[PDB]
Ligand SMILES: COc1cc(C)c(CNC[C@@H](NC(=O)c2cc(C)on2)c2ccccc2)cc1C
């Protein structure tokens with residue numbers, strides 16, 4: 001995280017005169033020479049979802065043509081208002097918008113976190129104005145994204161995290177028993193980030209309808225994969241607006257939508273639901289201020305990359321892309337299930353979590369780390385995951401992963417008490433008082449802003 | 452664009468050629484670019500130079516995959532962010548704080564304002580026992596304060612201004628309660644471009660032991676240099692002990708690409724209340740310095756590139772140009788007695804009239820090609836001067852168009868054409884109606900027909 005200490009001149013103060021552009025560019029391209037092989041060659045779990053040179057180059061030029069655009073001035077850039085409205089319209093359609101009576105509306109945001117915070121804040125504001133709730137509560141599974149905790153703390157919503165079943169899918173009974181007259185929303189993930197499992201969405205959406213509460217499908221990860229997994233012959237239940245009780249769905253264009261980082265979509269079943277997301281200031285000397293998302297000034301150029309990506313790919317592009325990923329996933333799962341010292345948690349389609357009842361998975365992960373792998377460290381239970389992308393569908397990437405894993409297992413199988421590098425860090429963290437995890441994370445964030 | 456371009460309400464079956472998509476975006480670009488390139492737009496675009504944009508777009512291209520949530524993959528971007536903070540903190544007299552000044556890179560001024568609000572709320576709850584937070588801001592303070600207030604559940608007490616459109620500190624002193632967690636001042640405020648009495652506000656804040664956030668979103672990259680050039684600017688940054696947090700935008704006058712700002716806290720004890728930490732999540736340990744998870748790291752590299760390419764001499768020259776251009780603009784405006792400048796702003800000029808309908812004067816300018824901001828309470832229009840306004844004859848043209856605008860309205864005092872009666876209605880309308888028309892506008896914006 002800090003390897004450019006000696007390599008390049010640091011800057012704690014603005015230089016008196018301006019440094020040449022060639023020089024500035026020379027540094028960035030040199031860091032890109034060190035950093036791009038990790039993602040380009042397929043060693044990172046998620047992080048970069050497309051990664052083709054011509055696709056990246058395509059979206060860079062897209063960015064360049066629209067680099068000055070800011071949606072806060074639709075008068076000046078009506079193209080960006082077109083791009084945003086058109087991204088929303090298309091995403092909505094792909095997530096059963098027609099089924100919901102053509103009332104599905106939404107806005108383009110910065111990321112899945114924004115989408116989840118905005119949905120969480122909307123249900124709060126909606127339930128206070130229409131249900132009278134002043135002490136909101138949200139029932140979500142333990143596997144639901146960390147952002148649910150963010151929204152809770154921020155918006156003063158009580159978050160009730162409910163257990164999972166033997167398949168790591170949400171326990172609807174536990175969800176039902178958690179519902180009180182103050183529950184404003186219940187959520188399910190399509191799929192979750194931890195183990196890549198699609199929660200039982202039809203049963204969650206029916207539960208929300210029965211109590212007259214909201215149902216949010218966090219499809220930030222599978223929004224642009226599951227519609228195409230369905231059409232390919234893979235087991236995927238209806239998870240979107242085709243379900244009567246589903247009131248909002250988030251899906252990330254910057255993830256498997258293959259857009260530049262900095263874009264997501266938040267969808268609501270009806271406009272009356274959407275209007276509660278907005279903030280309107282009527283008495284400010286600065287004029288009438290109306291904002292649909294968290295931010296005022298928005299990078300318009302990134303809405304254009306989301307639009308460009310969807311249009312460049314089309315339904316055929318997504319089917320191809322999804323098939324490649326699920327076949328890489330089929331092959332990867334087959335190999336892990338062929339090393340009986342390791343187990344896959346639940347039955348994921350492409351975000352594969354691997355744990356071990358016989359050995360220290362953290363050390364296994366470290367062995368892979370030494371081979372160049374950038375895997376996601378997981379706890380509760382201690383495991384690691386591989387979120388497969390188009391970067392892992394490239395020639396011999398899954399074969400390299402499988403080879404490196406057979407070796408990784410063997411090394412730990414030969415030295416069960418081995419804990420090198422990051423392995424004793426994950427081990428101390430998995431069983432640590434929350435305040436210790438608080439003091440270290442704080443220290444780590446501080447470590448990133450040092451000069 | 453209704454029929455100008457083909458609508459896309461559904462994904463096409465097969466993907467459209469990449470060359471085809473670019474051509475459509477470039478078509479839309481070419482119709483939209485002259486409006487800001489010829490300096491007709493007040494603010495919105497702050498640098499606008501072809502060679503700078505090309506430089507910054509090459510920087511984007513090299514860091515496009517960058518996502519700061521993965522510092523292990525992009526250590527380049529953790530360096531850029533740390534460095535954008537450091538350089539900013541130093542420019543805003545963070546050295547006077549004794550090197551304790553720290554901060555983070557954000558998506559814009561709104562996120563920086565919201566973050567500070569959430570932070571003072573959390574800080575005050577943890578350390579003072581405040582469960583009903585209250586915040587005191589002048590009425591001139593940004594609308595993001597109201598957004599921040601509704602989101603985090605902080606009572607926002609908006610205080611009146613003085614005859615010079617600066618904050619009435621006495622009004623703010625009488626607004627402070629034991630539930631007040633923070634005060635704010637704008638350097639400058641968006642409406643009338645004036646700098647609030649920040650020393651007096653920080654002195655009030657320090658006296659009460661509550662935070663003081665300075666909204667330097669618009670002026671953080673202009674005011675340090677206005678001072679160096681001898682212009683009168685009240686000390687507004689970390690030079691003042693009472694100032695506990697300062698927010699500034701690199702995407703505005705910092706000349707970095709859109710989607711970046713910086714929030715600075717005087718102490719790390721304060722900054723730590725901004726961070727989000729999750730410990731029991733099956734997905735691992737999750738930490739986030741700001742609101743976001745994933746972020747476009749490429750935008751942080753552009754702020755780092757811009758800053759280093761300009762340095763002190765660059766920002767001084769850029770500011771010299773803008774302030775001189777504004778000196779000329781205020782002089783010309785002052786020479787049209789039917790109009791008045793609200794307060795004494797350095798470069799964000801707000802012109803209003805007690806004789807003619809300013810909304811009609813503004814309508815006349817729109818007709819000539821000028822993109823100006825509508826302001827109510829009082830009715831007025833503002834011009835945020837940028838580098839595009841420093842180009843030859845831009846200011847001269849504005850004043851010719853403005854002299855003509857005043858000539859017309861003076862002849863026809865009942866004239867209410869184009870957007871002029873829309874603004875007129877909105878300044879007179881009840882809040883419930885303003886809420887409804889604005890909601891319909893957001894819906895309008897997201898319509899596919
Ligand atoms: C009630 O009728 C309205 C409604 C509106 C919205 C307006 C325009 N105000 C201008 C306002 N921009 C928006 O709020 C905005 C955001 C998005 C997206 O699109 N526009 C604004 C600009 C800069 C700084 C502060 C505010 C004017 C009348 C008469």
Ligand SMILES: COc1cc(C)c(CNC[C@@H](NC(=O)c2cc(C)on2)c2ccccc2)cc1C
Nearest residue numbers: 425440441444519520521522734735736737738
């Ligand atoms: C020192 O204790 C820590 C502390 C941390 C933060 C970590 C990394 N967890 C991985 C975690 N990334 C961060 O939260 C993050 C944010 C920034 C900036 O940088 N990293 C994560 C990301 C995405 C999805 C799920 C999880 C590991 C140990 C051992």
